[PDB]
Design a protein around this ligand. Structure first.
Ligand SMILES: Cc1cc(/C=C/C#N)cc(C)c1-n1c(=O)[nH]c2cnc(Nc3ccc(C#N)cc3)nc21
Lengths: 543, 400
């Protein structure tokens, strides 16, 4: 059947005409196979035959079991067709679904049941070539949505939506969703009243030209849906003697997928082996870290876990734990500790951060995810003291705001590991530091002069102004005592250090962080260079 | 009859992602939009429309719909600026009182050129993507599109013609969905005149007090001290030297050379001769506007904002960096709420002064801003913005 639904008007892209691709000649088997296929399709109204008035054409092929398959190659038409609104903007996450008592599944096996805009059919013309390509072939055009055309998924789903809308209002308490060839229909009715309303829906579908002749758990989109719970469909981790790039990529994807419900999954050490572009077939020995990470993941996965569904009447609670080395993990529940969802956050935003910036970025990522899945932000439980957090964000120059949260004593706690002094330290030495690199030679010098008369200059190869300016500050911190004042000319290095990083991609910056933690007091100040400013011009001379 | 509207040559309609909405804002948009549809102001559309601009709900106690036409505005900027431009009166910034009136309901009476309507498409998302977003396009002039006041200009002139003729000293300026009405009247007579104007607008289906006269510059301030340490003078030299890049005349050497040798920061330093005096020139230099900086109408305005802490924020507006057209501060329960308020205040002032909104350089993570700004936004326009990492001492140099 061809649905009586009204058609969607369609246009070619502005300034373009429909395709005129030439049909390659085919084997007699393939011509025979296609005349048969097209004669059934013509009986059912899916296609019509047309004269030679129509100048448009799209190649057609046939490939074989003992089935024969028609293959209309819509590449040229597709790149001349307008764009459509896209079908799905996102996939529903299971953790956002509500508990259902009954879930039915009707067969709804598609495109050839939805009509195609009359003004557009001519551009779908195709030609069954005659034998050894001597007479003009038989010419058809589509009357329905052709398989493989750009507009079909969008126009089908829009048609399927208008058809359902009547039923969706007379039953605003029933959820209907479209998965492949099955329609999933869910209600909080018992099997009696449920499959009565299933019947009227199928009656309603039949009136629109749609034929309908599964038990939980439903396997869908990688998930396993049960009536009262959900999980990811089973993850089995291979037991290979030897690992290829290809095996580690597939394993990282599976662990990443499992992290949605299995808490604490780690992939950092396994991902680190994939750095440095190498062949998919090449074998990578596992470092001992990656083997401890693989070992830990296997224990996490030994017994199965499940997620619960969403109760709209209760709050969401989000908990975050620090797993170390930029790795964060989180759980969302409504009753402790029955998880709707878990996840991980392990992004380096910035070359240098601290745990407070990383925890706020993680809260931001969880907040957005909550809006999408549940339409509502959760209450946070975070491993950071209220005092730490408002010490940091008030003094810091970016704005922030995280929603309602509460401290939770789950170590490691987030804390600032050092504090720069607010004003210069009486009785402590003052270092005037400076770095410099020659842009040609990549050669540089770093050093200091102190108010107590000391001075040092080291030399540096394969270096930049940026690294010599940080080298100078590191020098000052090694040679000084527990308290020190440091005058630099580098806004670059002051910027970094005033942000109180506790981690960095630069081993230099990490060495400085090592030093700043041992110190009892450090005042850091900036002066413009090349203004003859006391010690700064004098240390500038040396470098 | 409808005014034909055209995009820029070889420009396509906007395809902007909808940001996720909370259940409460989705539900508000749904009711607003069903009522507009039954009144015919918008219509459901099918998948053959691939365009999108984002939509939000904001508050004045009752929800209001805000469509982000920023992208469309850029792609129709020949229509509303060079073809049907609304001229900006230099008189407005000189008035003692300026009242802002929303006149956006005017546009719901004018039909929109049917060949343009598809470009106004927008989506109401659904929670958890369980259902296809509800999709709509405009049939009338939409609020927030800079094409609307340009097309309505003809009619606005006919509405205001009696009131302008009877009050020749009042300046009325339209910007997007607002009227700016400025007078030198005493505040009571000014309010009375706003009331009469409301009555003129009410006979055609059209239903907050600024004092531009008192928008004083925020000069760069230099400390006045009893004693000066090494540290104090270094901070002073750094602050003067950065200031010298905006204010020609700023000099630092006399101050510089009492800092010679490598002395401790804590060492007290008595000022020298022209040293103490140059703090007088430099002070005298910095408390008056920049010579030779002028607004170029063909260039974009930029606004930079620094967080100073303790509920205070500084800002500068410029077109080419260091040549500030304006500098200010914003005074005084959330970092994002405060910043959202400063952005709205800076945009309003700059509508009044130049008839243009600035592009904002905002000191905040993008996702934090996009997740929270609508909880506090009250204007009907949206300026362009981008996210930046404030240089460390630019904040120290604009500190009070
Ligand atoms: C997004 C979705 C996907 C599928 C795919 C199925 C496949 N394959 C099926 C349905 C009905 C829905 N669906 C929708 O569109 N709105 C819903 C509200 N609440 C639930 N909850 C729910 C769903 C299934 C079970 C089970 N077993 C238990 C609870 N689903 C909803």
């Amino acid at each position: 059947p061809i649905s009586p639904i009204e058609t969607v008007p369609v246009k070619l892209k502005p300034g373009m005409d429909g395709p005129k691709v030439k049909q390659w000649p085919l084997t007699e088997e393939k011509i025979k196979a296609l005349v048969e296929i097209c004669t059934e399709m013509e009986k059912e109204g899916k296609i019509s035959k047309i004269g030679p008035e129509n100048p448009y054409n799209t190649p057609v092929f046939a490939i074989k079991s003992t089935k024969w398959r028609k293959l209309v190659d819509f590449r040229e038409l597709n790149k001349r067709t307008q764009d459509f609104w896209e079908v799905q903007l996102g996939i529903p996450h299971p953790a956002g679904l509500k508990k259902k008592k009954s879930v039915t599944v009707l067969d709804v096996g598609a495109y050839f049941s939805v009509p195609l805009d009359e003004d557009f059919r001519k551009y779908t013309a195709f030609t069954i070539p005659s034998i050894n390509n001597e007479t003009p072939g038989i010419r058809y055009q589509y009357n329905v949505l052709p398989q493989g055309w750009k507009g079909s998924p969008a126009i089908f789903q829009s048609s399927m939506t208008k058809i359902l809308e009547p039923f969706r209002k007379q039953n605003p308490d029933i959820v209907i969703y479209q998965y492949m060839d099955d329609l999933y229909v869910g209600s909080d009715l018992e099997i009696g009243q449920h499959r009565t309303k299933i019947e009227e829906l199928r009656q309603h579908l039949l009136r629109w030209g749609l034929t309908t002749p599964k038990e939980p758990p439903f396997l869908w989109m990688g998930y396993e849906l049960h009536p009262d719970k959900w999980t990811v469909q089973p993850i089995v981790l291979p037991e290979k003697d030897s690992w290829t790039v290809n095996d580690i990529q597939k394993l990282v994807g599976k662990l990443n997928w499992a992290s949605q419900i299995y808490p604490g999954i780690k992939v950092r050490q396994l991902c680190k082996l994939l750095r440095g572009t190498k062949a998919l077939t090449e074998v990578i020995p596992l470092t001992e870290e990656a083997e401890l990470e693989l070992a830990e993941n296997r224990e996490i996965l030994k017994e199965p876990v499940h997620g619960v569904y969403y109760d709209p009447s209760k709050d969401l609670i989000a908990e975050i734990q620090k797993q170390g080395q930029g790795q964060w993990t989180y759980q969302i529940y409504q009753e402790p500790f029955k998880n709707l969802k878990t996840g991980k956050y392990a992004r380096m935003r910035g070359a240098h951060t601290n745990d407070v910036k990383q925890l706020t970025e993680a809260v931001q990522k969880i907040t957005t995810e909550s809006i999408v899945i549940w339409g509502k932000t959760p209450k946070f439980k975070l491993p950071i003291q209220k005092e730490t957090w408002e010490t940091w964000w008030t003094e810091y120059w970016q704005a922030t705001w995280i929603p309602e949260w509460e401290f939770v004593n789950t170590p490691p706690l987030v804390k600032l590991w050092y504090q720069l002094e607010k004003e210069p330290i009486v009785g402590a030495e003052t270092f005037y530091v400076d770095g410099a690199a020659n842009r040609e030679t990549k050669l540089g010098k770093a050093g200091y002069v102190t108010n107590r008369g000391r001075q040092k200059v080291v030399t540096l190869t394969d270096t930049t102004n940026q690294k010599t300016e940080l080298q100078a500050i590191y020098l000052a911190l090694q040679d000084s005592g527990l308290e020190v004042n440091i005058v630099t000319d580098s806004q670059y290095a002051l910027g970094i250090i005033q942000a109180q990083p506790d981690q960095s991609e630069s081993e230099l910056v990490n060495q400085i962080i090592e030093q700043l933690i041992k110190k009892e007091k450090v005042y850091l100040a900036w002066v413009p260079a090349h203004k003859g400013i006391g010690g700064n011009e004098q240390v500038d001379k040396l470098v | 009859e409808t005014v034909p509207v055209k995009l820029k040559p070889g420009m396509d309609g906007p395809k902007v992602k909808q940001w996720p909405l909370t259940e409460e804002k989705i539900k508000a948009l749904v009711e607003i939009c069903t009522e507009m549809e039954k009144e015919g102001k918008i219509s459901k559309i099918g998948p053959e429309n691939p365009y999108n601009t984002p939509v939000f709900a904001i508050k004045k106690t009752k929800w209001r719909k805000l469509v982000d036409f920023r992208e469309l505005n850029k792609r129709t900027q020949d229509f509303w600026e060079v073809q049907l431009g609304i001229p900006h009166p230099a008189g407005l910034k000189k008035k003692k009182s300026v009242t802002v009136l929303d006149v956006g309901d005017a546009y719901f009476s004018v039909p929109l050129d049917e060949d343009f309507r598809k470009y106004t498409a927008f989506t109401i998302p659904s929670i958890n993507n369980e259902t296809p977003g509800i999709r709509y396009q405009y049939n009338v002039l939409p609020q927030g599109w800079k094409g609307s006041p340009a097309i309505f200009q003809s009619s606005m002139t006919k509405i205001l013609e009696p009131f302008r003729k009877q009050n020749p000293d009042i300046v009325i300026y339209q910007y997007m969905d607002d009227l700016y009405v400025g007078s030198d009247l005493e505040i009571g007579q000014h309010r009375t005149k706003i009331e009469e104007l409301r009555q003129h607008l009410l006979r055609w289906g059209l239903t907050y007090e600024l004092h531009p006269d008192k928008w004083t510059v925020q000069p760069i301030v230099l400390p006045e001290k009893d004693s000066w340490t090494v540290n104090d003078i270094q901070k002073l030299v750094g602050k003067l030297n950065w200031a010298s890049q905006i204010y020609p005349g700023i000099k630092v050497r006399q101050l510089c050379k009492l800092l010679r040798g490598t002395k401790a920061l804590t060492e007290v330093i008595p000022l020298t001769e022209e040293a103490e005096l140059e703090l007088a020139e430099n002070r005298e230099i910095l408390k008056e506007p920049v010579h030779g900086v002028y607004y170029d109408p063909s260039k974009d305005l930029i606004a930079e904002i620094q967080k100073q802490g303790q509920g205070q924020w500084t800002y500068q507006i410029y077109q080419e960096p260091f040549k500030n057209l304006k500098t200010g501060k914003y005074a005084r329960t959330n970092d994002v709420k405060q910043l959202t308020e400063a952005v709205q205040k800076i945009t309003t002032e700059s509508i009044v002064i130049w008839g243009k909104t600035p592009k904002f350089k905002l000191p905040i993570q993008k996702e934090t801003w996009e997740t929270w700004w609508t909880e506090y936004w009250q204007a009907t326009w949206i300026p362009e913005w981008e996210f930046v990492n404030t240089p460390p001492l630019v904040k120290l140099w604009y500190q009070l």
